[PDB]
Design an enzyme around this catalytic site. Structure first.
Site, PDB file in Angstrom:
ATOM      1  N   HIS B  41      -0.746  25.358 -31.279  1.00  0.00           N
ATOM      2  CA  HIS B  41      -0.118  25.316 -32.424  1.00  0.00           C
ATOM      3  C   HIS B  41       1.308  25.734 -32.021  1.00  0.00           C
ATOM      4  O   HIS B  41       2.027  25.397 -33.246  1.00  0.00           O
ATOM      5  CB  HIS B  41      -0.877  25.552 -33.520  1.00  0.00           C
ATOM      6  CG  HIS B  41      -0.763  26.926 -34.199  1.00  0.00           C
ATOM      7  ND1 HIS B  41      -2.051  27.821 -34.339  1.00  0.00           N
ATOM      8  CD2 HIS B  41       0.270  28.068 -34.146  1.00  0.00           C
ATOM      9  CE1 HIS B  41      -1.734  29.100 -34.664  1.00  0.00           C
ATOM     10  NE2 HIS B  41      -0.362  29.217 -34.602  1.00  0.00           N
ATOM     11  N   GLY B 143       3.475  35.125 -37.799  1.00  0.00           N
ATOM     12  CA  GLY B 143       4.000  35.545 -36.396  1.00  0.00           C
ATOM     13  C   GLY B 143       2.915  36.402 -35.504  1.00  0.00           C
ATOM     14  O   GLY B 143       3.417  36.606 -34.330  1.00  0.00           O
ATOM     15  N   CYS B 145      -0.157  35.157 -34.641  1.00  0.00           N
ATOM     16  CA  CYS B 145      -0.717  34.536 -33.669  1.00  0.00           C
ATOM     17  C   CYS B 145      -0.646  34.562 -32.274  1.00  0.00           C
ATOM     18  O   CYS B 145       0.727  34.850 -31.964  1.00  0.00           O
ATOM     19  CB  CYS B 145      -0.480  32.999 -34.168  1.00  0.00           C
ATOM     20  SG  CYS B 145      -1.039  32.457 -35.822  1.00  0.00           S
TER      21      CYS B 145
END
Lengths: 304, 304
Positions: B41, B143, B145
């Protein structure tokens, strides 16, 4: 979202841990520049620990009696001195992994990370608070002495704790990196009882603010209080007195959430008087006091 | 003595964290050998996240669109592929700090350390469990991930988790390092509800054994039970069924303490039925289920 008991990343401190052996005693040392710091009780037999005369014991020790191993490489000891309750072993090699660092003496209620080590090898990292009675509630087995407590500010490690002692009640006592014990404790195997373990009120309030920020709001009530009123209740429950300095420190959390500090005090007052009624706050059934206001801001803002 | 929620020392994983940027999205990557692993993603605009077609989105991306920074040095991306829900970015430089490592897919009830990162920079480390509903209860802000979960066996890092998603209920979902989600979750901003968060019975029992080892014994009672009887009570309280495999895994703790597993089950049965009555166990007012039997042995024996 989510709020966890979070330790500092330990890599910078991992690079500083060594093994110190004197005779049959092995514990951990901290290698910064060309100095290895370790508890002075490394020179004691368990017999010695009953009534050690450290200056007398140390006279019988030479540089070559301190065996310092960093990984599986031996360091050459070129000097040794006692500062309070720590030994400083001068080695001929500066630790190439020495981070930017400071030695700080923390106040009760301040939190820090412990890197638990055995034989100079890291086993784990956890978050502690200096208790109001100057103990910490750690996880330390035989061999763990010289494990250190620290905070990190971007790239600077502030060392605040070196592990020395377990009291007969299974709580922990140690020194700053100048070798001064926190509290009245001594490096002797004798009767040493801790005082009252009071709750760090300002940390509980910080953690209630963390709970609101993270969606846990059931405990917010319609009441307010005063510092004096709140403090009458704090005293009864063995909570530390709340000062205007504490209210000022909570200002940014007050601001972010729009809950006045004295309103959150009144929520905490009702929780003390009424209990949790089987409910939880941030996955806890008791009021957590090992997060500082600075901890809550750091975690809730994502500081690296 | 003392028992703490302890994370693995994070240094080996700190050396693997990088920043990955694609367009305006920045998150964390894991650099092992000449591959950087990150959530796919990274290629999405928050708009894309509502109904992303990842294969279609990825066609518009070239190697030079993936900006990979390790500290303040850029890595050259020479290849990229999608494996399930992760991107593998081939770089021209092997990570010189690559530890011995494995990729493992853990089972629910298994615990691991998370190194929370932002912009490729470690902020903190905490201990998690894979919940029975295949969520984790983390501390992750925007932030975070590509932050990873891991266990360490002496010098070998087993990576088990990469952070991808927060559900609207503020619990966390991610993948193994092959990019397969734990549980039924998808990397799409849609309705995804977690199932029942049951208690990891075998971990509670492990932690009760930890409590006895550490002097907390008030909850030991005069009773025993059977797996079937205990399980009728477990079911009522949303506890996972206890199996003979769990009883076998608790054998070394049974042996060390001399408390038969089914006797400790009967203590746990009374705690479920009666509550704690305002008492604590290892400083907790609820029954802790994020220590495995292996965790308790490791901590109680001091494995490095």
């Amino acid at each position: 979202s989510g709020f966890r008991k979070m330790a500092f990343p330990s890599g910078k401190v991992e690079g500083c841990m060594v093994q110190v052996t004197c005779g049959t005693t092995t514990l951990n040392g901290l290698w910064l520049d060309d100095v290895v710091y370790c508890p002075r009780h490394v020179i004691c037999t368990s017999e010695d620990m009953l009534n050690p005369n450290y200056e007398d014991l140390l006279i019988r020790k030479s540089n070559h009696n301190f065996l310092v191993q960093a990984g599986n490489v031996q360091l050459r000891v070129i000097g040794h001195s006692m500062q309070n309750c720590v030994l400083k072993l001068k080695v001929d090699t500066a630790n190439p992994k020495t981070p930017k660092y400071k030695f700080v003496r923390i106040q009760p209620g301040q939190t820090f990370s412990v890197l638990a080590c055995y034989n100079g090898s890291p086993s784990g990292v956890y978050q502690c608070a200096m208790r109001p009675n100057f103990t910490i509630k750690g996880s330390f087995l035989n061999g763990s002495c010289g494990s250190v407590g620290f905070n990190i500010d971007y790239d600077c490690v502030s060392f605040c704790y070196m592990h020395h002692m377990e009291l007969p009640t299974g709580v922990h006592a140690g020194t700053d990196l100048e070798g001064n014990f926190y509290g009245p404790f001594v490096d002797r195997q004798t009767a040493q009882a801790a005082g009252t373990d009071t709750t760090i009120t300002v940390n509980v309030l910080a953690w209630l603010y963390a709970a609101v920020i993270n969606g846990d709001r059931w405990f917010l009530n319609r009441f307010t209080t005063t510092l004096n009123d709140f403090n009458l209740v704090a005293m009864k429950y063995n909570y530390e007195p709340l000062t205007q300095d504490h209210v000022d420190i909570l200002g940014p959390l007050s601001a972010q959430t729009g809950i006045a500090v004295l309103d959150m005090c009144a929520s905490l007052k009702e929780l003390l008087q009424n209990g949790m009624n089987g409910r939880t706050i941030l996955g806890s059934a008791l009021l957590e006091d090992e997060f500082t206001p600075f901890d809550v801001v750091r975690q809730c803002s994502g500081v690296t």
